[PDB]
Amino acid sequence: MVATVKRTIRIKTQQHILPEVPPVENFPVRQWSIEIVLLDDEGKEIPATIFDKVIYHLHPTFANPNRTFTDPPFRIEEQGWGGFPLDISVFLLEKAGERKIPHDLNFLQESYEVEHVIQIPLN
């Protein structure tokens, strides 16, 4: 009689470069979307060795990046002027699903997203 652990990290990134509305001189507006989802209540909500997911997006001049350990999923999509790299690192124990995937945000009509799964029912 043993338990089971199944947690997957899914991050969606999109971007849109287009003015749409005729500007007066210079008004280049772009779009951007970033969401971070994962399991916890299904794959045991208790840590073992490491288990820590840290998301990163946009320039590092920010006050604080994204973190995942005891908080709900994230999802922000709006229009603005930016365009910078974005990488997400996932951890579970040691050699279960510890992986990191880098991405970039600066292309008209971007549709780049990753989905990684992690399973550790025994070890």
User: What CATH number does residue 89 fall under?
Assistant: 2.60.40.1970
Q: Could you tell me the residue range of the domain that residue 36 belongs to?
A: 1-123
Provide the number of structural domains found in the chain.
Answer: 1
Q: What single-letter DSSP state applies at residue 119? A: E
Task: Please give the Cα distance from 53 to 26 (Å, whole number).
Answer: 39
For residue 114, count CB atoms less than 10 angstroms from its CB and return exposed for 0-12, middle for 13-18, buried for 19 or more: middle
Cα end-to-end span (Å), the chain: 15
For residue 67, count CB atoms less than 10 angstroms from its CB and return exposed for 0-12, middle for 13-18, buried for 19 or more: middle
- H helix intervals, 14-112: none
Task: Please give the Cα distance from 56 to 85 (Å, whole number).
Answer: 8
Count of CB atoms within 10 A of residue 105's CB?
20
Task: Please give the Cα distance from 82 to 16 (Å, whole number).
Answer: 11
Task: Please give the Cα distance from 82 to 104 (Å, whole number).
Answer: 11
Q: Which helix (H) or strand (E) holds 80?
A: strand 74-80
Torsion sign across C-alpha atoms 43, 47, 48, 49? positive
Task: Please give the Cα distance from 3 to 18 (Å, whole number).
Answer: 50
Contact (Cβ atoms closer than 8 angstroms) between residue 7 and residue 92: yes
Contact (Cβ atoms closer than 8 angstroms) between residue 85 and residue 102: yes
B/e letters for 32-59, b = 16+ CB within 10 Å, e = fewer, are: bbbbbebbbeebbeeeeeebebebbbee
